[PDB]
Amino acid sequence: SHEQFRAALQLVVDPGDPRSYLDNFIKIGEGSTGIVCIATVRSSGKLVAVKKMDLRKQQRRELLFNEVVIMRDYQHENVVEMYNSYLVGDELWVVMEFLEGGALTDIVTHTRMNEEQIAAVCLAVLQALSVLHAQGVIHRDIKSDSILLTHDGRVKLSDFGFCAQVSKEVPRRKSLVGTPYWMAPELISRLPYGPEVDIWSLGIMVIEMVDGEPPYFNEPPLKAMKMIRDNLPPRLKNLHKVSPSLKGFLDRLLVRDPAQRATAAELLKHPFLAKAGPPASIVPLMRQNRTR
Numbered sequence: 344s345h346e347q348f349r350a351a352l353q354l355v356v357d358p359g360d361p362r363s364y365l366d367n368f369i370k371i372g373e374g375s376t377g378i379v380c381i382a383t384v385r386s387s388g389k390l391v392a393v394k395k396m397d398l399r400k401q402q403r404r405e406l407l408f409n410e411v412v413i414m415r416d417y418q419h420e421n422v423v424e425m426y427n428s429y430l431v432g433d434e435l436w437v438v439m440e441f442l443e444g445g446a447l448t449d450i451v452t453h454t455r456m457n458e459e460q461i462a463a464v465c466l467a468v469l470q471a472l473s474v475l476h477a478q479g480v481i482h483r484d485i486k487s488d489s490i491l492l493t494h495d496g497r498v499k500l501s502d503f504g505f506c507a508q509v510s511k512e513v514p515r516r517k518s519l520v521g522t523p524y525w526m527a528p529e530l531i532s533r534l535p536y537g538p539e540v541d542i543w544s545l546g547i548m549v550i551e552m553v554d555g556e557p558p559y560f561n562e563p564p565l566k567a568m569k570m571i572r573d574n575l576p577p578r579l580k581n582l583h584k585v586s587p588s589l590k591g592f593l594d595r596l597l598v599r600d601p602a603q604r605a606t607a608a609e610l611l612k613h614p615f616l617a618k619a620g621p622p623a624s625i626v627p628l629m630r631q632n633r634t635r
């Protein structure tokens with residue numbers, strides 16, 4: 344059953360051992376589903392990132408199929424590129440493009456972005472979500488650790504370990520998948536749910552960027568899940584330290600009623616996103632830049 348599951352994965356990953364073509368593996372990070380190293384391609388000296396995920400250590404093993412099939416050849420500007428997947432021992436390795444500037448999380452916990460920078464982030468995420476959502480692709484793990492930056496301050500979405508495929512004919516999902524604090528309420532109450540959860544989650548990430556943490560962060564995960572289910576959408580604490588455009592934008596995102604919650608393609612037309620700075624307005628936020 345392990346052995347069966349390993350066999351099935353072999354059939355969908357690229358053949359070969361990537362240790363043949365890659366060196367200098369160095370752990371630089373962790374997810375729930377596994378670890379992240381950097382490596383270097385033998386032939387060219389180019390750098391890549393590599394997710395290793397132990398097949399025996401997953402909360403839900405079969406999710407491991409999602410990323411490797413769904414993003415197989417997909418190539419958007421605001422999405423991280425997957426190059427290749429391999430099965431190495433009892434681990435799945437996914438070779439990806441390496442992003443220099445690290446994740447949004449580091450920025451959101453060490454500093455308070457202005458609204459131009461916040462817009463820049465949301466604009467980029469939404470582009471990604473527009474194209475993705477239109478292909479029946481739910482990410483289901485939008486949060487600040489899923490957002491990566493280039494050294495020049497461009498923004499890409501990552502962490503497709505939890506994504507899903509919907510279709511015209513079979514519409515909703517019901518499974519409880521995500522990171523608790525960022526979960527949409529209908530997902531928590533395992534009612535039929537769809538793309539719109541990503542929009543809610545982006546809502547929470549906007550509260551991360553403003554208040555420094557998602558709602559209920561101080562609480563244990565299972566309780567928090569219950570609380571998001573039972574309560575009404577969370578309000579900003581910094582109500583007055585923010586602008587009408589942003590507040591307006593937020594209220595389109597943090598709607599309980601999925602049917603009334605906005606869509607990505609809608610939200611691109613939102614005026615708030617017209618404050619979005621260029622890539623270069625993100626760069627002073629990065630670890631290497633903000634402390635002199």
Ligand SMILES: N[C@H]1CC[C@@H](CNc2nccc(Nc3ncc(C4CC4)s3)n2)CC1
Pocket residue numbers: 371372373374379392393394423439440441442443444445446488491501502
């Ligand atoms: N849970 C996440 C895991 C990735 C990341 C941790 N490490 C990290 N630190 C600095 C730069 C960097 N760049 C990457 N480029 C591509 C990357 C591919 C998707 C893993 S990670 N990664 C942020 C927390």
